[model samples]
Target: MRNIYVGNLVYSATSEQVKELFSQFGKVFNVKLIYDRETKKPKGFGFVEMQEESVSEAIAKLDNTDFMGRTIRVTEA
Candidate 1:
């Protein structure tokens, strides 16, 4: 499985938001946009499953890219 770490997400960020950004490169199989256990709030970071073949494209395009009104950090995990 290929995993990519996404950081600096805004509290309002959602899985759909993540999906849309990464989907520009290729198919998105899984998205784990974490949430706080009690508050049910976003943790400002998450992981996405990017097809191995599309890793380079996704990373190159999304790294340091603006997302959810903030410039996010995308890195290989």
Candidate 2:
């Protein structure tokens, strides 16, 4: 298992959305998008778990991809 860091996320992006995006690369074990507990808003960053390192290529391919009009940043966690 490996943890991947995703940054520059749009405020409207959700955990489910992030998972869907990364799934294209490989099996997404889990996803956690940071948010403000009180306000229930996105924190613009998150983490994702990949079952294998080969998935890194997929992540790289999707890095900087546009989502909800914002560019995403994907990297090793």
Candidate 3:
């Protein structure tokens, strides 16, 4: 398995959307979006858990890519 750090996401982005995006490369095991403790709002970043072998491709294809009007950043955590 691999844990990927995804950042610079739009405020409206959701785990389900992230799952579908990463699913193109491989099975997405989990998607966790960070939220502010007090406001309970999206922090514009998250972590994605996926198959080990699919990590490199996912990162390569997704890093600095545009999504929801922002350039998302993807990297191995």
Candidate 4:
């Protein structure tokens, strides 16, 4: 597994929800959704680690797409 930066998320997004969203391409082994670090709120952006074989496709498909009601930027971390 490796990290993929999934950015521009909204306040309502959750790690559990994101795991399922990315799992469509392959297995999501980990998620590092950063929070406020001061409060318990989300940073509104985070990383999701997926299986190696699926990384490229996942990045390609989701990059600059209309996702989660906003344009998402999926890039390799």
Listed in order, each prediction's TM-score against the native is 0.70, 0.66, 0.74, 0.73
Off by over 4 Å in 3: 21-25, 65-71
- Could you list the CA RMSD of all candidates, in the order they appear? 2.9, 3.2, 2.7, 2.6
Candidate no. 2 TM-score: 0.66
Q: Which stretches of candidate 1 lie above 4 Å from their native place?
A: 18-25, 65-71
Better of 1 and 3 by lDDT: 3
Instruction: Give the residue spans of candidate 4 off by over 4 A.
Output: 69-71
Alpha-carbon local distance difference test for all models: 0.72, 0.68, 0.72, 0.70
Which ranking of candidates, highest TM-score first? 3, 4, 1, 2
Clash pairs of candidate 3? none
Error of 4 at 20 (Å): 2.5
Tell how far residue 12 is off in model 3, in angstroms.
Answer: 1.2
- Can you list the residue pairs that collide in candidate 1? none
Q: Model 2: per-residue lDDT, tens digit, 1-77?
A: 87888777656664556467657756687877777667788876787777767456746666776566344667787
Q: Give lDDT tens digits, candidate 3, residues 58-77.
A: 77766777566333677899
Could you tell me which residue pairs clash in candidate 2?
A: none
Candidate achieving higher lDDT, 2 or 3: 3
Q: What is the lDDT of residue 53 in candidate 3?
A: 87
